[PDB]
Amino acid sequence: GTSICTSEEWQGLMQFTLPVRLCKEIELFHFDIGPFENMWPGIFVYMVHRSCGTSCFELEKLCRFIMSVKKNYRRVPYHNWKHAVTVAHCMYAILQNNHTLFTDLERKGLLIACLCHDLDHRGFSNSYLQKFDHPLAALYSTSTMEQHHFSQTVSILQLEGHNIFSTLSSSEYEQVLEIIRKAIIATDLALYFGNRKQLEEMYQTGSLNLNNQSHRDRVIGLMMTACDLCSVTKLWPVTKLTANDIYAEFWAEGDEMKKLGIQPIPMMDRDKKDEVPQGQLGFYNAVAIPCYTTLTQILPPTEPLLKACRDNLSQWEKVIRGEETATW
């Protein structure tokens, strides 16, 4: 089912104003929402306003939406409200450096998609649900969770006075849902591998063209992935801390696989922490680097995200060689 924010919750956010000093920081790729928990909702409003305009959605309908989107996230270590807003910010940063490539309808859809992309997450992966045949795996055969995430989004839209997209033409309403659906589905990392490879080939052969709708969906696809993984693009100490959350969640799933007579993969096994560095190294070379490498080629203003990822790759190599500092 679906939860609704209180009258007290959405009204408090409307009064919200972003401290002056933050306006300058929020624009940067490396900005870290972490030290500002109370502000997160109003941080998103700010990004929506700056990107899509103040007269984009009715403020009340938007604020009701956001605080209900907050409440429908779970107290899991990683795939939580904190993550949703961190992905939204990275998208906002990309959009601001690439504003005129994307239409007004796309930007609003992509920002909403990022905030909604992990809705009602349980801390269990696609592997888990399909290995053990959860009812979600039978209803959604591929990209299982990502389909539930979008289904959750639509359910929140259908709440009393929550529909932010109502003041669009019925044709544009169809379009923005499809943009959102295609964005949320693209966060399934299984799909990423094929997407990047294809996008790379289209760029090298020069056939890439943003006026071709199928190309746009793919670039949007890579952008979604870039935002999903942006923890690997923050400053090393922030990157290190977030990893602890990702693994805290991985390990609790491993704790379930054991009882049902399965040795879970090394990455999810809490008695196998020693492999974590080399696992990150592998994940950067196989997924992260190539994702930010390709995105930069397509959108050169996004280059700082790749610089920061190369930076964190280097720090994981340092941890492997035993050169690790304290960092808490």
Ligand X SMILES: Nc1nc2c(Cl)cccc2s1
Distance of closest approach, residue 328 Cβ to ligand X, in angstroms: 18
**What are the angstrom distances between the C-alpha of 188 and each of 197, 225, 264?**
15, 8, 20
164 burial via Cβ count (<10 Å: 0-12, 13-18, 19+)? buried
168 binds, among ligand X, Ni ion, none (CB under 5 to 8 A by kind): none
For 72, phi then psi, to 5°, come to: -95, 10
Distance of closest approach, residue 184 Cβ to Ni ion, in angstroms: 8
- Examine residue 232 and tell whether it contacts ligand X (CB under 6 A): yes
Residues 176-205 that bind Ni ion (CB under 5 A): 187
Nearest-Å Rg of the Cα atoms of the chain is: 20
231 binds, among ligand X, Ni ion, none (CB under 5 to 8 A by kind): ligand X
Selected binder of Ni ion within 78, 92, 113, 118 (CB under 5 A) = 118
Nearest to 65 by CA among 117, 122, 3, 145: 3
N- to C-terminal Cα separation, the chain: 38
Q: Is 79 a catalytic residue?
A: yes
Distance of closest approach, residue 20 Cβ to ligand X, in angstroms: 33
> Of 60-68, 110-118, 272-280, 283-291, which segment contacts Ni ion by CB under 5 A?
110-118
Of 185 and 299, which CB lies nearer to Ni ion in the complex structure? 185
- Examine residue 246 and tell whether it contacts ligand X (CB under 6 A): yes
Tally Cβ neighbours within 10 Å of residue 73. Answer: 22
Residues 186-215 that bind ligand X (CB under 6 A): none
- Examine residue 319 and tell whether it contacts ligand X (CB under 6 A): no
What b/e sequence results for 265-281 when a residue is b if at least 16 CB atoms lie within 10 Å of its CB, and e otherwise? eebbbeeeeeebbebbe
Selected binder of ligand X within 231, 233, 294, 315 (CB under 6 A) = 231
Give the CB-side neighbour count of residue 280, counting CA atoms within 13 A: 25
The encoded tokens of residue 107 equal 């930007």
> Catalytic: which of 30, 79, 89, 99?
79
Nearest to 94 by CA among 157, 28, 164: 28
> Of 41-49, 99-107, 111-119, 130-138, which segment contacts Ni ion by CB under 5 A?
111-119
- Examine residue 279 and tell whether it contacts ligand X (CB under 6 A): yes
Q: What residue ranges bind ligand X (CB under 6 A)?
A: 229, 231-232, 243, 246, 267, 279, 283
Residues that bind Ni ion (CB under 5 A): 118, 187, 228
Known catalytic residues? 79
